[PDB]
Design a protein around this ligand. Sequence first.
Ligand code: NA
Lengths: 103, 103, 103, 103, 103, 208
Amino acid sequence: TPQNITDLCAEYHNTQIHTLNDKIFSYTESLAGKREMAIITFKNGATFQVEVPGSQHIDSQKKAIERMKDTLRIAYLTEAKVEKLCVWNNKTPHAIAAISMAN
Amino acid sequence: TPQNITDLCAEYHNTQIHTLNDKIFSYTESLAGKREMAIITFKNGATFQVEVPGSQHIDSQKKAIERMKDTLRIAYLTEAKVEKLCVWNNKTPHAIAAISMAN
Amino acid sequence: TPQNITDLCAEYHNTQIHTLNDKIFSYTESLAGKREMAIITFKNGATFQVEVPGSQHIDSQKKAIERMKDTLRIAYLTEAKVEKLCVWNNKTPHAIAAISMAN
Amino acid sequence: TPQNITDLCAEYHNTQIHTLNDKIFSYTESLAGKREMAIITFKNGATFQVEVPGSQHIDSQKKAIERMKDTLRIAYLTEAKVEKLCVWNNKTPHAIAAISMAN
Amino acid sequence: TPQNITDLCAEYHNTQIHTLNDKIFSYTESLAGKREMAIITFKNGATFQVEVPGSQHIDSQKKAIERMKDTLRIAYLTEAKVEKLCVWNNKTPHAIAAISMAN
Amino acid sequence: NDDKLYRADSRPPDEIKQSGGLMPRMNINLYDHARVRHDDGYVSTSISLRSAHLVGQTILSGHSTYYIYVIATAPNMFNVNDVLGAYSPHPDEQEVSALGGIPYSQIYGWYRVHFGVLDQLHRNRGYRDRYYSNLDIAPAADGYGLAGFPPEHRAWREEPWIHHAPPGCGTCDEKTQSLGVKFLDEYQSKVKRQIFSGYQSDIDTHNR
Ligand code: NA
């Protein structure tokens, strides 16, 4: 079991770590049919999604997707410093797999 | 997949963007039968609803509708600036499809 | 579809608006069997409940009853001004059907 | 319907009202199997639990038990003054049935 | 039924108490498949996980795992002092079973 | 940064909690405020423990018990001497004043003073270190316009206030008031975003 986000990320294909060390600049959330997703940006212009749930996610990932939207919504509002994001880079925008917050 | 709320909105029929760049002036919610909904306003008199769930909504939107109402209440209480709303304009009040927040 | 709490309340025969324009003085909740409810009061002695879910409620109301209790607890802890309550006045304490919050 | 915690509490056998008028001193919660509970204490040493869900509980109580744990956590974290608890006194530690918060 | 985290911890095999009296230094959360977990650290170097829900868990533990990750996030973002952690030490990182917060 | 400021105040911690912080005696006027200082919309603080202790020794010498609150820096604060300049009436005070007072979360902790003897620091649970440590005092250029001199005072026709003179200055007092009210509204709104967002970081959509 990985002890940090970087080791976690390395277990998967098509991922990379972005190091932001910055708060989230924008949080966007949608309930539109087939676009039930969130999108975050940072001030350097970097953009990331939490994906619409589908068959690329296993059942166990379904609740974790919901938790990530809770977390990103409140991280945004709380201005918490995002250390790193682990994301799938086979998607546009890049899709979040993991986040770490620290100061 | 869309990169921001504006492109997201443009994917649907009967939607438009409202740019408010302001906090929510009032939050209303109801558990009255057939009116299980939320209504928000802004100081400029603009009024929006999160729709009562119904046949116009597909199963995957039901969870997102619930998250959106929370998102509005949270934004109201923290006085967070709402940048944009994407809404369906074939409804009165205009019905929220998506929200962006940027400081 | 109504644009505000007053208009929403008037769609029901057994309801009335109370105008408080004040924060919640006390919040009470119970998990005791057959009394899974909340009760709030205001400085002026006015007392309201969120009813236990029962046969008088349709399915769509069940989730909304849970959200209302969420809303009241956070409203209480943040000292948010409650503008109006729509309540059923054929219950004692009167039973909350909807809430509006405005500064 | 009861208008307060004291009258609510008196509808049950084996219950009594504790009066703290104080913030929670400590909040403890476990995910350990068979000990899925919460324990709070006050600075006078008084200790209370929200019980592990079991046979003594009817279905309508399952969500209220979960809600009470949410309530005790945020109370503790916000330093919210607890007024009274309704407790079952035939359990050790005394098991919470209800809580009121007021200043 | 135990009255504190130390007595609770001692009911299980391969656990130990960690006394931290410190706020969480970092919070990490993943929705990646089979790594649906959270990891926290403290400034003294210690790292802990909430485990991926698995077959070591009974069904009553599932909701409590979710609650615990909720608890760690608000503790992190409110800088709540963690008093003690009860953890399983046959896991790397050590796996959280219970948390206490005071002071 | 993580700089701290200090204020002697006879109001106890329980009252500070209940009030939501250290509040001023609402008129908001820095000039008038500067002529323990808490009138006209601002609350005074000192740049050192020993300073605040001395202020309390002479002003609160009479209360069996008072308190020295330890306070983080944030953009609700003005260096009085920088904002008022040569017209700072009591510039030996080295004062930093909090416009609308000091919210509870900005309070790091407090010492108890009993009969002149300082204790033994008590940490505030409401404090948010990362938030407040990433914040500093307001630059004086945000305060020049809230200086709050009379319309006739020579400052409004002199640098730097000449370029920040509220309308009618150099209804001047009307505008000084509404600019301070606006500043305080905007400031408090940021603080409630921070504390009340924290209070809602427990929400878990999936579980119900
Ligand atoms: Na600071």
